[PDB]
Amino acid sequence: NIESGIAHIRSTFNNTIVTITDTHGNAISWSSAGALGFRGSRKSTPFAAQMAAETAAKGSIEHGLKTLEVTVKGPGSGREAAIRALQAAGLEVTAIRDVTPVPHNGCRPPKRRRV
RNA sequence: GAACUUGAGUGCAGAAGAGGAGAGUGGAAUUCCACGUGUAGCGGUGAAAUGCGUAGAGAUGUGGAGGAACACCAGUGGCGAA
Numbered sequence: 001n002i003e004s005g006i007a008h009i010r011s012t013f014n015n016t017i018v019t020i021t022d023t024h025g026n027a028i029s030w031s032s033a034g035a036l037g038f039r040g041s042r043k044s045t046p047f048a049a050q051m052a053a054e055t056a057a058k059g060s061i062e063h064g065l066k067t068l069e070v071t072v073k074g075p076g077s078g079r080e081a082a083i084r085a086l087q088a089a090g091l092e093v094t095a096i097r098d099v100t101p102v103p104h105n106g107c108r109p110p111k112r113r114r115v
Numbered sequence: 116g117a118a119c120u121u122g123a124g125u126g127c128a129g130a131a132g133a134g135g136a137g138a139g140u141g142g143a144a145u146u147c148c149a150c151g152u153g154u155a156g157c158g159g160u161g162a163a164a165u166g167c168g169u170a171g172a173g174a175u176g177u178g179g180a181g182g183a184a185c186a187c188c189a190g191u192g193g194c195g196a197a
Binding site for chain 2 (some may be wrong): 006015017019020022023024025026027028029030031032033034035040041054098099100101102103104105106107108115
């Protein structure tokens with residue numbers, strides 16, 4: 001029953017993560033995009049981000065979690081709503097991380113969709 | 116045939132440059148493998164499904180292997196005959 005923990009913001013066009021883990025990155029409860037029986041486009045809404053974040057928060061409160069250190073890693077779709085949901089309990093976002101390649105074209109990305 | 120120095124070279128003194136060839140080296144990210152935590156989805160689309168997941172995926176942490184390309188700098192900026 002651990003006091004402190006982490007969550008991990010990493011946002012794209014329509015993908016975001018924020019799982020509830022311990023200080024050393026051992027998991028406890030998890031939040032990332034959906035998880036909650038939502039499907040399709042509803043899954044990527046800001047609303048559905050809240051309900052995923054609440055459900056992982058209320059999972060971790062039962063493990064005696066009081067505070068959540070969260071990261072920063074660019075803007076995206078439903079990142080702000082996911083934080084608002086977590087501020088039911090209350091917490092901080094101190095760290096700032098990144099998912100970027102130090103080469104433009106480190107690995108070659110997949111081809112542009114013709115739509 | 117004789118001159119000349121404006122062309123064209125040489126000498127001398129500076130300058131900038133992703134010009135080229137060779138050898139070595141670095142960090143970020145992806146992938147795979149191993150392991151810890153954890154558990155039911157993940158992923159994807161206009162909407163789906165095939166896929167991948169309880170033989171424990173996805174997420175998260177740590178380490179290992181390997182290849183390729185070089186964020187920011189970076190600019191009708193530079194260099195090059197192209």
